[PDB]
Amino acid sequence: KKVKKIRKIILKEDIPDLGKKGQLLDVRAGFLRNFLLPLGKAEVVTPLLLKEM
Amino acid sequence: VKVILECTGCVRKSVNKGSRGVSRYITQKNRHNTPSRLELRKFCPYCYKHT
RNA sequence: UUACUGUUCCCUGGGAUUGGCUUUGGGCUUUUCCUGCGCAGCUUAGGUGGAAGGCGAAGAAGGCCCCCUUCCGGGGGGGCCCGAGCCAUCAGUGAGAUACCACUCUGGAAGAGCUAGAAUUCUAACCUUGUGUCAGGACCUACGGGCCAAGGGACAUUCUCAGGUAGACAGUUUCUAUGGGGCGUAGGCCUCCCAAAAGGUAACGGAGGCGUGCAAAGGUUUCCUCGGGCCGGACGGAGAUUGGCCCUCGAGUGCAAAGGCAGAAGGGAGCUUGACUGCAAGACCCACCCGUCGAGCAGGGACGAAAGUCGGCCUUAGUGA
RNA sequence: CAGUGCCGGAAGGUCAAGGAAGUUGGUGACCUGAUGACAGGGGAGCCGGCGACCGAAGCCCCGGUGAACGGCGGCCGUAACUAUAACGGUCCUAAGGUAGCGAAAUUCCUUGUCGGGUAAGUUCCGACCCGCACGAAAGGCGUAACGAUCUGGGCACUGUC
RNA sequence: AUCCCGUGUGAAUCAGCAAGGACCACCUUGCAAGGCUAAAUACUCCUGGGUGACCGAUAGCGAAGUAGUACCGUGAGGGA
RNA sequence: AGACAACCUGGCGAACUGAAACAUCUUAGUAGCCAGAGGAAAAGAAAGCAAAAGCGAUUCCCGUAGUAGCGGCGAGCGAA
Hints:
This is part of a larger assembly, with chains A and B.
Chain A: E1 9-10, H1 29-36, E2 43-44, H2 47-50
Antiparallel strand pairs in A: 1-2
Chain B: E1 5-7, E2 24-26
Antiparallel strand pairs in B: 1-2
Chain B binds four RNA strands through residues 2, 15, 22, 24, 26-29, 31, 34, 36-41, 44-46.
């Protein structure tokens, strides 16, 4: 019935799957929370950091 | 089998004085179809009230 | 309890906690190539448009052969050989040049995307485990904290919706008459008797029917009227078609009975839909709710030359707020 | 193993929420004709309804399963005197009571017939059998021992009489 | 319709948004998801003042003297 | 941090009953139990009501109205 968020991110260290610290692949919500944010292996796309870095 | 069946006029939905469908139910059709000239419709006379 | 309605336990699907891949294939996509024997013919005419030059040495016509499709008519096509052409209103044809273009529809193939489906898969959260690990002034082989372990693995667990589902559990019902109750029968309408010469009348008092049928068995204008005896004529028979005498309406009238009806309400013909709309004084019945008849008027008709009859059916059952 | 239960299948059918191609309806900028009185069709968008197809278990369906719920049939004929039927025919179910026991804590009729016991016993024991309606783990049949058990006859002992 | 809640998706903000009993337009009112606030108001185991067409000894409080007493119940509790 | 007569707010919340039975409904969100607090509490300053006319935070009494309405359109409930 329903799909869940597919949330943009930006990286902090190379991904063995999608990109080497540059790409913006909208990973998944069930993925940013554990591997990406626990392991500090990603940063969420804040509109604040974008236009200042 | 004596199923009911209603008869009907010549509709012509209009903006005239209240003109309107005029059903007259009747019975007995165990045959082929039967129309009849039941009358005194909205318009005064009538003929061939079918179905 | 296989009575009614439900709850809980349990089972399954949808959503949430919920993630990595990398594939198989279902439904949309978007870019990559063949597809065509209406007949007049240069001849297997693809529709619709731009439409006077494309296509060539980043190397054609032609013949030598390979492959695939096939209606063995030919079509797409690799290789080599070849080396200065295959081309347009040039006319046919509803529609044009294989010069060429965008594609494209006739359908068909694949790497590209959504959401699923399935499959295995690992690791980050989840469940589970640990004599293991260190300690706080002491241990925590006193449950437990952090830590790494080891299994399991996005399944399970929980939360919500949905289908199924144990009387395990709950909330309730299960009629009355009934010459005691139960068993049996009965429960509404119509007709005859009991019903006592208006009406009405009771009993598990005695006889029966109904829960319809008919486009005609309705409506009109007409005509004649049955039966059961006897006599005639072959089978024909006790009883079937055909002519003559008694008759009380003993025949019938769709279905029960009573009352009715033989100028018929009995039977048959002619045309037809009045088995219409708006109604209605007054009556009958009358606990109420119901129910029944109705002169007469207006419209618009049928039949009938006219008078007149016709808003269902010989009347009472065929129906329920 | 017919019905039910349970288990295993689940190929096909019915199969909920939900998902969903479409389709439909209202509202509606602007549009259009007439005596008088007002409609109609209608961009967008916003709100609705119906919905092809998809949607698991369940059930239907198919097999196993009775120390799982339970069930175990009648009528009509013939044999060597007459009879009773060793044996046959018919509808039937899923099949038609096996072994044992039997008028039995189950037999109504019924103090059933017969034998023993008694002077006389509807009680009692042993048999027969037409088991109204016994019967195999709601077990069948029988058992030595045991019973403040129910039941029949004894000897001794007595105011029970 | 408004009004608060469980599950999941999950807007805009003033050339906006909510309400005006589905919904859609136009108009009118009010503008959410932060908080606080006196009075008029209901009450009596009670205290003070007053009143009684209220009782006056099985009535009035159950109770006009050691009355929740004696007594009864294990206990809650009953109760002269 | 314990106590409380009644009044109040919150959470959980029955049943006998009425419907001449009874499962929707009604007794009723009453009783009771738990949790707070006050002399009062709760509510409250407008995303309100209205209706081409106006109001202006709450809370109570009168009255509209036993009307509108809801309802096995039954018993009954009953606003503004």
